[PDB]
Design a protein around this ligand. Structure first.
Ligand SMILES: [K+]
Ligand SMILES: [K+]
Ligand SMILES: [K+]
Ligand SMILES: [K+]
Ligand SMILES: [K+]
Ligand SMILES: [K+]
Ligand SMILES: [K+]
Ligand SMILES: [Mg+2]
Ligand SMILES: [Mg+2]
Ligand SMILES: [Mg+2]
Ligand SMILES: [Mg+2]
Ligand SMILES: [Mg+2]
Ligand SMILES: [Mg+2]
Ligand SMILES: [Mg+2]
Ligand SMILES: [Mg+2]
Ligand SMILES: [Mg+2]
Ligand SMILES: [Mg+2]
Ligand SMILES: [Mg+2]
Ligand SMILES: [Mg+2]
Ligand SMILES: [Mg+2]
Ligand SMILES: [Mg+2]
Ligand SMILES: [Mg+2]
Ligand SMILES: [Mg+2]
Ligand SMILES: [Mg+2]
Ligand code: NA
Ligand code: NA
Ligand code: NA
Ligand code: NA
Ligand code: NA
Ligand code: NA
Ligand code: NA
Ligand code: NA
Ligand code: NA
Ligand code: NA
Ligand code: NA
Ligand code: NA
Lengths: 69, 108, 151, 97
RNA sequence: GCCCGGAGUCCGGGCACCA
RNA sequence: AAGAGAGUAGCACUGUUUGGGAAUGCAGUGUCAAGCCGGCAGGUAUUUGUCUGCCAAGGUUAAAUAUAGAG
RNA sequence: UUUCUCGUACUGAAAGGGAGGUGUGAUACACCCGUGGCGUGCGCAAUUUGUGUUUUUGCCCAACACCG
RNA sequence: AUCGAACCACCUAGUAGCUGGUUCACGUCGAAGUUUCCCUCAGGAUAGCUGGUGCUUGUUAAGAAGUAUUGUGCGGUAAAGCAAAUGAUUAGAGGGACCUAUUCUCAAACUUUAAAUGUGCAAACAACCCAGCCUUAGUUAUAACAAGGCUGGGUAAUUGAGGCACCAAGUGGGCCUUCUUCGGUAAGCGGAGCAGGCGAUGC
RNA sequence: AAAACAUAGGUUUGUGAUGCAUCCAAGUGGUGUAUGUCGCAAACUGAUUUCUGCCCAGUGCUCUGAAUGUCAACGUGACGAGAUUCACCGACGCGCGGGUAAACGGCGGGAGUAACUAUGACUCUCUUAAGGUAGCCAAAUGCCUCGUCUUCCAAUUAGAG
RNA sequence: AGUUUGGCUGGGGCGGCAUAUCUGUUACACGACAACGCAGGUGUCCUAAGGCGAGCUCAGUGGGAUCUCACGUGGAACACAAGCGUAAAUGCUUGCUUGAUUAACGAUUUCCAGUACGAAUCGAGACUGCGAAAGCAAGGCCAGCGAUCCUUUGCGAAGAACAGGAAAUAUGAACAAAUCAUACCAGAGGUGUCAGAAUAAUUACCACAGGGAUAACUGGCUUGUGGCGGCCAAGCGUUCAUAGCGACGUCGCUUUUUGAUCCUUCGAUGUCGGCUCUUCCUAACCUAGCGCCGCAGAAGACGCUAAGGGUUGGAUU
RNA sequence: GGGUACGACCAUACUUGGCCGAAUGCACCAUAUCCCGUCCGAUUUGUGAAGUUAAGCGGCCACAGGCCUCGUUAGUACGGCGAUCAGUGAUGGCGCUGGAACCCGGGGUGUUGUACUCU
């Protein structure tokens, strides 16, 4: 016995029950894994220097406050 | 619908259950507290009969094998022939006064 | 259900134009792309290499990767009850700079200019007023125009 | 399809890190060993009374096979295997038309 | 896939089949 | 000073059995030992040399265990 | 301190190996009251008259580093 | 009184994606007949629709919207055309064919042109603009660019709760109507697109 | 309840006993066989009368053809330290070559042509293992079909010839 | 003796492949969209028909004796089906070549569950080819192909290390020497029912669980076919379209034929014909009443109102 | 007002025919020892001006074809939403609204950057 083949009826109603969720924000999953390697490798060396400078800045800020107290 | 479950492997397809057509293959433990009482009664009765002999005969101290139990000590079956000679006791006479004797131990 | 390949409904979509055939010009070659830009994805159909799928023709997205002869763009796409952020790699010929933010940027430039001038407007037709015709015609649906609509 | 007898291909060996001349010979499958683990298991399962114990696959549909070439270098004895598309007649004449 | 025979060559033959 | 169980153990083929996998146990037929540097076992087949543990092919033996349609 | 089991460490087919921070040098050296750094972050603390700031818990994102 | 394989007891409560049944009340919510794979088509697994348990938060909007505005992209359907390419096709006129300029009538698998209804993106605080710096093994012949940071100054209507998990049910025979449509002489016929309904619901 | 089966008659096959057919799980076991070719066992046709044509390519059965090609265990030799590997030998059967249809079965097309037309004894040509012989028929076997002619009725998709 | 003897399907069977796939159209100007819908393809082929540099211009037309000049927007060619694309080229000729190799498990698109397979896009490293260079090339653009288990091939060359290290493949578990076997990584032998069982018939002697999800008979929708009628008027009728007819066209009605469908019924609605008996319809054969004729009489043709009454006996089947 | 070289947009720049052109230039032109390539110095390559503005090039013109632009076709064709609207139907108008195309008519026939350059 034959039957139905295909229909898109009721599918738009189902998709909007819980809505079409908005896309993820642009700041959420932003990793350049497969990109241009020469630029990726260079950015790592800059980031390592930024982390080292961040640690040094907190050391001087803490020492200055302790001297005042 | 199945979902994210483990694959069961329950191992119960061998007619172990007693029903109208099968005798079954089961073992229960309803006599456990009764058998505990009976064994205790026999131990007290044996002590009364053999008085004043000790309940258990003397046994040696041995080392457990393999690397997992290298450092552990327990009791062995019986004393060695070399050990009995060192203490000056005959083996057949030793069994008479309540000393267990083992003729297979090696004393390495 | 038969014959759904990579280019199914593309007879008129990837056709070039009338009297506008050819290959990309120098102005296209000299365009500069940088990460964070907005671009439109349109096919060229004279460059077979790096041509995007038919779904992404006419779509607008942001670039996340720059390569020696290619650009990577992030494009939204609704699937069932959600939109997926897709990444496509295309050649620089199938990509155009987008003007979808020039009005916004021009608004910012005007605001700072207005503040800069202040540191150193329109006529509403909605409100009423006097009207002096000096002449008044009449519309009357003459019988001549009824006779006109006869081919 | 016609193929040359020699090719100039890159050699990955440390001694010969350059383009060298390779000799082309078609690959043929070896002979089954009768003492492979799978063959020992099959012979044990097959002995007895139950008849045939495994499938035989009579429904053959393909009419060609893929071509595998073994490329043998001279100075460094390394071998490199390559695969071509399916074809019905493979020849190694190398004499250009 | 084996062993032959007749023209490395195609056929005729007796055999053998776990993707 | 001697000795300690022979169509026995082993091997080949076939069948069955086992978690036992180049073969765990057994059965049939063929073949069939050693003890003057012995034999068996040591979980991957073969040849060679060590090491470790035992000494088959005869027999008896309480207690702790079962009573799943009995007395 | 159980005599066994689950857990406090994982990784490789295997032989095997086995995870703290900061500073200074190119089984290295010296210290040990301690979040590896960045972003968004309940509550609390301190300021201005509502704003700006510190520490941020839990969680999440992206970059190090260390073990096989 | 039993025969295309007798009767009796047992294995046996044999297996059944198939047919039948399945026992108190009130309350809060509430569907699907669709996607992919399967010796699959009277059945399953998988996603969707639903319930329960929440977590993190907020008090005008955080990563809000089946809706408009402004700006900026995409398209070849209706229409139109054959006096424009491809194809079909009627008749005269000027130099039997042929040529030149016309003329009647056309196209789901023709088109120069080309709507309406549509469809991407943007319209700010995890951001922007400017100033002064830091780093790099990236670019450039080197001022200049890239990228990651640090320190000071200024910054599109109207509706309203945002985000993130875990566990699981039923369902996977549909049918009707508006408009657009394909096959068929047609059908209360077979097959699709958009929306609303019945199924599950009375008044 | 018959047109089916059986029957007398006819034909074919195997077989001289350490046999042919054949039962049983098995044995110094059992049946035709208390038998001996005018016998026993296995098929087909179906009284009498008169007959029983051609085909051995296919499948089957069979041969006192094994002549040669191919093959399994068992045997005999080699390389190797050995497991392993290789070589040679290796029966029936298959292949090859004969016989057999009262074994299963099978048994043709197309043109031209005789003093009116019509038919074609005669010719030619394709083609098989052989190309349906003696007989019989719209028959319980003929689609077309209620075939065509005679007979039987006033009239017959019926009956007979 | 045991078992099997595909699926889809306007019932099933025979047929076909709509079973894995590519182009145009259906398809309604984003994307997606079904039918045993329409027009056609695919399991191959190519050491060049792959890569690059250079030179040139094709189909065709016209004027002159294969040769020559001019025009020539592609009307040619690009292995094959179609679409798109291309003129100092993506076409043709020629020269040199092997980028159809390797490519540290880099990222992504199409199908999509945001799985795999097939195909494709953008990259980093090695060694190269063609170019004076910029540059192009890891096949021929998009269709041309394949899991687990098993079999088979390639890589783990020789040396260096007083110790397993940034550098020497691992194991065979009491230990050593040589064979053998096995693991880890990359390919190949195939499943076309193409996400991948190893597979012949018959049942009228038949069985079971079910199905009105599905055929054969009644009923329902339709009316192609069947049947019964209108409209126009070229002709036929001694001349005369219409007494009577009426071609070429066009408009309807009926459900008394046969088709098309599959709505009800498969825990059953007794399936042809004849006999008997009642009733209804009119599209009127006879009986009643009228008009008209190519109606002298007679016999008839046509038309209207009319269903009250009637409509036979036999041969073969 | 010009020329040359390198360009951007790629016909308001194209096609046919006609008329004119100071200077710097561009070009036609002369010739094969050497570099280089052909059947042929025709193309290409190397050498250098004895001539010529005939051609190429630039400017202008043509009720010329094309192309660009504005109107007209036309609120026409077609469309979204509504009706217990009209009509036997085929179809159509109405309400709130979006809105073309060909033909035809008027106008137009390149704009410009960098460097070196003659009045
Ligand atoms: K369910
Ligand atoms: K009778
Ligand atoms: K007889
Ligand atoms: K024969
Ligand atoms: K024969
Ligand atoms: K490369
Ligand atoms: K299976
Ligand atoms: Mg369905
Ligand atoms: Mg489900
Ligand atoms: Mg019972
Ligand atoms: Mg005993
Ligand atoms: Mg029920
Ligand atoms: Mg509710
Ligand atoms: Mg229901
Ligand atoms: Mg009777
Ligand atoms: Mg006859
Ligand atoms: Mg008859
Ligand atoms: Mg009669
Ligand atoms: Mg007769
Ligand atoms: Mg079927
Ligand atoms: Mg391909
Ligand atoms: Mg039905
Ligand atoms: Mg009944
Ligand atoms: Mg009844
Ligand atoms: Na287009
Ligand atoms: Na023995
Ligand atoms: Na049961
Ligand atoms: Na399958
Ligand atoms: Na049902
Ligand atoms: Na169902
Ligand atoms: Na008879
Ligand atoms: Na005859
Ligand atoms: Na008759
Ligand atoms: Na399948
Ligand atoms: Na009809
Ligand atoms: Na009709």
């Amino acid at each position: 016995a034959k039957s139905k083949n295909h229909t898109n009826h009721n599918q738009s109603r189902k998709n909007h029950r819980n809505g079409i969720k908005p896309p993820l924000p642009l700041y959420m999953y932003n990793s350049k894994r497969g990109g241009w390697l020469p630029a990726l490798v260079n950015t790592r060396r800059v980031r390592k220097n930024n982390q080292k400078a961040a640690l040094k800045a907190r050391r001087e800020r803490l020492a200055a406050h302790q001297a005042a107290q | 619908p199945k979902g994210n479950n483990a694959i069961p492997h329950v191992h119960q397809r061998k007619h172990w259950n007693p029903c109208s057509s099968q005798k079954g293959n089961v073992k229960v433990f309803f006599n456990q507290p009764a058998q505990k009482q009976r064994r205790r009664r026999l131990r007290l009765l044996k002590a009364k009969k053999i008085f004043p002999r000790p309940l258990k005969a003397l046994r040696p101290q041995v080392n457990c094998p393999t690397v997992r139990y290298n450092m552990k000590r327990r009791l062995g079956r019986g004393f060695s022939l070399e050990e009995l000679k060192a203490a000056g006791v005959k083996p057949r006479y030793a069994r008479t006064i309540g000393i267990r004797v083992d003729r297979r131990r090696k004393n390495k | 259900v038969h014959s759904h390949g990579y280019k199914c409904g593309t007879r008129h979509l990837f056709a070039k134009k009338f009297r506008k055939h050819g290959v990309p010009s120098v102005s296209t070659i000299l365009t500069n792309f940088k990460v964070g830009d907005y671009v439109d994805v349109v096919a060229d159909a004279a460059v077979r290499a790096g041509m995007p799928h038919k779904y992404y023709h006419g779509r607008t997205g942001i670039v996340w990767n720059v390569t020696p002869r290619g650009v990577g763009v992030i494009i939204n796409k609704p699937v069932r009850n959600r939109t997926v952020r897709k990444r496509i790699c295309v050649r620089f010929e199938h990509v155009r700079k987008s003007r979808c933010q020039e009005a916004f940027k021009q608004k910012l430039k005007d605001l700072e200019a207005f503040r800069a001038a202040k540191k150193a407007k329109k006529v509403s037709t909605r409100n009423g007023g006097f009207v002096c015709p000096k002449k008044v015609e009449v519309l009357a649906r003459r019988t001549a125009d009824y006779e006109a609509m006869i081919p | 399809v016609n193929y040359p007898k020699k090719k100039k291909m890159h050699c990955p060996d440390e001694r010969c890190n350059a383009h060298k001349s390779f000799k082309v010979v078609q690959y043929k499958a070896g002979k089954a060993r009768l003492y492979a683990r799978g063959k020992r298991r099959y012979d044990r399962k097959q002995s007895g009374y139950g008849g045939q114990t495994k499938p035989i696959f009579h429904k053959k549909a393909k009419t060609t096979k893929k071509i595998v070439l073994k490329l043998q270098c001279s100075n460094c004895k390394s071998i490199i295997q390559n695969v071509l598309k399916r074809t019905k007649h493979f020849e190694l004449n190398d004499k250009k038309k």
